[PDB]
Design a protein around this nucleic acid. Structure first.
Ligand code: NAG
Ligand code: NAG
Ligand code: NAG
Ligand code: NAG
Ligand code: NAG
Ligand code: NAG
Ligand code: NAG
Ligand code: NAG
Ligand code: NAG
Ligand code: NAG
Lengths: 732, 738
DNA sequence: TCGT
DNA sequence: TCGTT
DNA sequence: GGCGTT
DNA sequence: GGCGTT
């Protein structure tokens, strides 16, 4: 048997008891190797009471997760109140414990904890008071999280109280988080060891040097969202009061090690120069959701922030307005360490050579985020002069892998016809995203002429008219072309289309024609020497193959094709005819979510290199009508989510090379070894879950091959008899 | 028991044996009232052999459908060959038989048939020869169908042979259809009684008066697709040979009663005036898929077609080209009986005052079809001057500038065009317009009340599948009569993370009754409260009310202000939970609530008390495991309850009892093991629909539920075939009456 | 099947 | 939450 | 106490 | 003879 039923043993002594609806902590059998357990996860069970005996026998337990077990009223889906009781020696009985998560539990005080504890989450609990006695002897504690104990989702009448010097005994505390606690001031006398202090979304409306006293090791400080602009809030929000916030000039001046500072959503119309005196080595500055729209056009403060790597200016928009132009201050020219600049959501209508003048010669600038700005005029040629750009986001505007390569995102804009003069000075560009535009154009080879280095072009969710024979031929390096969800042209009854351009793309490897509703009046034969993968899912190959033999050889000419996706093609039948005229190079064939109630298994002989077959989500009633044929090179077979009620003995036997097999979500009543014969030893994945198994033969088979059966402990389920229906096969 | 198991008795003596996989015709029990059967449907069974005994006891059988029983190789899904044998007195033993369908069966000759036969389908069979002997004594036969016996889907080596005068003995034959038979000429000496003759998609490449000799009663004639233009074909197609077709001037001149004539796909570059001489009654003329693009600009032939009601000129396009303009001949102003003119697929780029000049004064013209033309400039103001237009189709074009039925009202379809911003000057002179379709365009615009100003009579506006920015407070306020507004599938703006939206315009539309905000993905940063005095129905399906209701109490009263709302659709809203909170703050006027395809695994049934006027509740496609946790509450006025496609495994006794007014109940596609009368109590007599199909019912010997379902059999749909066993195996997936 |  | 205040 | 994959 | 809602 598996050792820790009803939970699952994972590698490295990791026990998973998540989502088992347990009312108390399982102590397991004494025959189980309890000392081997280093991690115990009990996420989202119904344990409302913990006891001295619950973890004592787990001699080497290091991580313990009791999250979501007894959620407070506001966080409960049904608003059920919950109070969790904990006996005094519950966690003291585990002197090896290093990581404890008690979040989303209705506890009202901190329990007694062992001196070994390194990490502690008390977030989203009912603890309203922290004090000196609560953290006695916890000298190893590095991380303390207690977010969300007083806000709209987990309310309290007043606020979280952190007693002065309550945490001061925690000598090794580096990370402290106290967000969403209704705090009106920074807690007094925090540990000097802190490098990360997070106080965001409280109402700390004034600051001063004494509020951050003796915190000279501080590397990251988040005091953002403490007096907010609720015109931008998606959640409940109190408006920043008039004449606030009030930050004393010298508030941050003693924080010499500070790398990151978050001042987002603090209703700031300007910055004080004094705040950043002594923060010359600041690397990250978040100024998002403020009112700095005018400040950034004229400020001189970036001359003193020369080490800055990331600068977030996003959603610094003026209420009720967008600007005609937005010209950045000259001082941005001094940010020579700058790698990432976020300018999304400022709202401005024109992007010109003046806009980003100051940034043009910054030697290390890689990312530039200009999305969601209502830009309707964009001079795209400006980006050619930049020395180091890898990513420009101009998505979600009104203009009319690709990791580590120069990529331009123009998705979700109002482009209707592409003109080549758009792309002048962008010959270095390797990836271009034009998805979710409105491009309806008989594209013909004169649209992308300047893009001589382009390897990836995403034109999904457009209305492109595939007709002219030289489409995309002006892109010599083009390797990947996404033309999915351009269905509207293919729904024009009586107006046909031409896909002969595919043959003229000499280095194309990936093509998607997915979800186009291709059903009639189209080229009879696709061809390509280069193409490796074609996604043709979400079309009507059914209708096409019903038009006599017009489309019998539609894929034939893709003579080096390795992957073909024919999922969601309304296919009720699939003949030897059709499979024989697929390219003989084919290794992976996907046929998910078709209408196949029958499949001639002997016809798989015609696909000599087929390794992976996906028939998931069809309506097969059985695995019979001839077995899998001899000499087949098949490795993966997915027949899950069918209605398979029985399997002929010796069905899988002849598939020597078979490795993965998914029989899940079927109508199987048993799991018989005669189906696989010799394959039972060779198989590495045998999914048999979500089947109505008759629980009274199969248990000894599954236990013998238990390493190959995923979710054996919990997911492999009985269908009969009642009393065991829907429950694990090991409940008896 | 139901009388004709395993088939179903329907009203009017109609027995349905379709799709039962029967290898022979069922004779039924002798206790069954065999004489009551007037219609027997056996569609798509596996009956390859018919016998003298099969229908003899059906003394009053009038209709018999044996379609798809033994499909020929080409029509078989797996290309299995099939030959159907028929004993001599199979149909003679039914002397009352009037309607016989033998289509999609591999028969090679016509069987012996009773003299009572009125209608006969031999379409898609293996009959390659019709002859004099085949129709002996069939004097009552009015309809003969035999389409598709020689073409790509049902091939023969040569063609269907119709012997001269083979059908001449059929004295009452009115309708004859012989499409897709590879015929090279009209069959000789057809019956003079014919009013409808259909010969489309053969290869009758020449015609003459003698080909249609003595057919003076002919009302409809289809000779279209007989020499085709395969550049437009979606199916296998042979090109019209050079110098063809060859129609003699006087071919149709003796057909005085002809109302409809189909000359589509005949590769005609012009018409002959002589063809229409003596066609004084001609009401319908189909000229589609020809090469008449130049002919229609200058022809004078429409001066002699003054009785014509429908004229189809669609797909008269010039190969490889579209035209800059298209100016119709002056003679179109002469078609004074014309009601419908179809001009889709000609391909022309500009629509002006000149284009349709000739049509402007035609007094009865209702429909004008200009779709699929690649038009990029359209002067829409021209349509105001027309006296009788009800429908103008300008859909699927390239135009970019200057729900109630709409069937009997002036409607303009501009859907599937390239409009990005709407300018009011588009709609000048269209103040009479009552319905406007702008769906599947690319409209991305902060619409604000200055876009539709001329449309003073507009009641219905479809803006679905666009990218409209709902923000300004006066959107659509310039439409005073606006009753129905579809803003569904405008989701992209609502996916702009951090850019919020404003739906306060809904309150400013004083006569709005229907609104759709469906499939918009509305999830955050939106107006907290919708309001309207007038609104009756709101489709809010396909959004994330789940996310909205998870933001504290911001959207707690989101629907509250719709104070006269009768229908609310909250389907596909990702709702895992549904509290008393949320239902209490819906409008108390609400009568129909739809919650299909949400994520509801639990439902507090007692909270239905808070919706006092609720009559229809749709919870189909959720994940309810049982009907329990309190029963339906007392005084509930509920009439329809749909909890189908859940995982309901049991029902607490007395669950439905308190719902006095309950009429329809859908429990189908669940995990129910029985059907217990204690669930309903007194309701069992009251219920009019009780769907219990696709449930894994436990069919034990003397199972409780069979006597309950039989007692209430009029209320249970698909009882004969669809009500199914789940256990034990050997009965699994089969009928409860096996 | 979209200015040959 | 998009030329206001 | 029930609810739910956050 | 089997397949399949045409
Ligand atoms: C937070 O503090 C305010 C002001 O003292 C108080 O009114 C409110 O009740 C407190 N709690 C919450 C959950 O907002
Ligand atoms: C920006 O582009 C314009 C138009 O080509 C040009 O006149 C101007 O010199 C360019 N540079 C600057 C710094 O304005
Ligand atoms: C695309 O169309 C334009 C306009 O007709 C033409 O000038 C151009 O040569 C075409 N491009 C190609 C590559 O044929
Ligand atoms: C598709 O285009 C190519 C080249 O433009 C042409 O040779 C081919 O015949 C076209 N297809 C059809 C169906 O006309
Ligand atoms: C099954 O496939 C084999 C081999 O391709 C072929 O001989 C046979 O005709 C097929 N049978 C059916 C029923 O389709
Ligand atoms: C139709 O007849 C032609 C010529 O008489 C012949 O070539 C062909 O075999 C027939 N076509 C079909 C589809 O039966
Ligand atoms: C259409 O007209 C009919 C009768 O004239 C009327 O019943 C109906 O209300 C009208 N519908 C619209 C949407 O204008
Ligand atoms: C709508 O917006 C346009 C452009 O900003 C403006 O001209 C017009 O006055 C606005 N309409 C109304 C009704 O205010
Ligand atoms: C929506 O617009 C109305 C009037 O234009 C305004 O009163 C209301 O505050 C707006 N909604 C939001 C969320 O600002
Ligand atoms: C009950 O629901 C099913 C789908 O779940 C549907 O097929 C059926 O039509 C419904 N019953 C009635 C009587 O309409």
């Amino acid at each position: 048997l598996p050792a820790f039923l009803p939970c699952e043993l994972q590698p490295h002594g990791q026990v998973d008891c998540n989502w088992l609806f347990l009312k108390s902590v399982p102590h397991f059998s004494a025959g189980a190797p309890r000392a081997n357990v280093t991690s115990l996860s009990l996420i989202s069970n119904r344990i409302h009471h913990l006891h001295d005996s619950d973890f004592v026998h787990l001699s080497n337990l290091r991580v313990l997760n009791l999250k979501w077990n007894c959620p407070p009223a506001g966080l409960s889906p049904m608003h059920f109140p919950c109070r969790m009781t904990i006996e005094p020696n519950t966690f003291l009985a585990v002197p090896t414990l290093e990581e404890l998560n008690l979040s989303y539990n209705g506890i009202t005080t901190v329990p007694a904890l062992p001196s070994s504890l390194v990490s502690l989450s008390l977030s989203h609990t009912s603890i309203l008071v922290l004090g000196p006695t609560h953290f006695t002897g916890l000298h190893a504690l590095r991380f303390l999280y207690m977010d969300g104990n007083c806000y709209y989702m987990n309310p309290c009448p007043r606020a979280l109280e952190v007693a002065p010097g309550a945490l001061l005994g925690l000598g090794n505390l580096t990370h402290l988080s106290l967000k969403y606690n209704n705090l009106t001031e920074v807690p007094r006398r925090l540990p000097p060891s802190l490098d990360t202090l997070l106080l965001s979304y409280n109402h700390i409306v004034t600051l001063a040097p004494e509020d951050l006293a003796n915190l000279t090791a501080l590397r990251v400080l988040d005091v953002g969202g403490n007096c907010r602009r609720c015109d931008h809030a998606r959640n409940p929000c109190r408006e920043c009061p008039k004449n606030f916030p009030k930050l004393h000039p010298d508030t941050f001046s003693h924080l010499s090690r500070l790398e990151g500072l978050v001042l987002k959503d603090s209703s700031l119309y300007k910055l004080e120069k004094d705040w950043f005196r002594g923060l010359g080595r600041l690397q990250v500055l978040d100024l998002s959701e403020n009112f700095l729209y005018d400040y950034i056009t004229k400020t001189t403060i970036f001359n003193d922030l020369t080490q800055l790597r990331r600068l977030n200016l996003s959603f610094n928009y003026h209420k009720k307005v967008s600007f005609a132009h937005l010209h950045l201050a000259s001082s941005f020219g001094s940010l020579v360490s700058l790698e990432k600049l976020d300018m999304h959501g400022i709202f401005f209508r024109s992007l010109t050579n003046i806009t980003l003048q100051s940034l043009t010669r910054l030697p290390k600038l890689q990312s530039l985020h200009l999305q969601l700005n209502f830009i309707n005029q964009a001079q795209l040629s400006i980006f050619g002069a930049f020395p180091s750009l890898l990513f420009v986001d101009l998505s979600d505007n009104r203009i009319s892998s690709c990791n580590l390569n120069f990529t331009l995102d123009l998705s979700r804009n109002n482009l209707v016809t592409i003109q080549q003069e758009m792309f002048t000075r962008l010959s270095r560009l390797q990836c271009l995203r034009l998805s979710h535009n409105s491009i309806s154009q008989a594209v013909n080879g004169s649209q992308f002429v300047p893009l001589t280095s382009l390897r990836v072009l995403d034109l999904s969710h457009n209305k492109l008219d595939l007709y002219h024979g030289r489409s995309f031929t002006e892109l010599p390096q083009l390797e990947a072309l996404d033309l999915s969800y351009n269905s509207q042209p293919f729904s024009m009854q009586g107006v046909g289309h031409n896909l002969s351009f595919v043959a003229q793309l000499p280095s194309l490897r990936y093509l998607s024609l997915a979800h186009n509703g291709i059903h009639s009046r189209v080229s009879q034969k696709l061809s390509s020497a280069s193409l490796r993968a074609l996604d043709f899912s979400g079309n009507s190959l059914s209708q096409m193959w019903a038009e006599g033999d017009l489309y019998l050889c539609f894929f034939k000419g893709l003579r080096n094709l390795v992957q073909l996706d024919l999922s969601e093609n309304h296919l009720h039948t699939l003949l030897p005819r059709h499979l024989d005229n697929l390219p003989k190079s084919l290794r992976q064939l996907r046929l998910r979510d078709n209408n196949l109630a029958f499949f001639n298994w002997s016809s798989l002989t015609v696909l000599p290199r087929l390794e992976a077959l996906d028939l998931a989500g069809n309506q097969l009633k059985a695995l019979s009508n001839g077995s899998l044929p001899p000499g087949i090179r098949l490795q993966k077979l997915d027949v899950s989510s069918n209605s398979i009620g029985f399997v002929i003995p010796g069905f899988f036997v002849r598939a020597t090379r078979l490795i993965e097999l998914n029989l899940s979500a079927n109508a199987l009543k048993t799991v018989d070894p005669s189906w696989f014969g010799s394959l039972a030893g060779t198989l590495k994945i045998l999914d048999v879950s979500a089947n109505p198994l008759h629980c009274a033969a199969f248990v000894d088979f599954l236990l013998e091959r238990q390493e190959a059966v995923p979710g054996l402990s919990r997911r492999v389920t009985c269908g009969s008899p009642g009393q065991l229906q829907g429950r694990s096969i090991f409940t008896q």
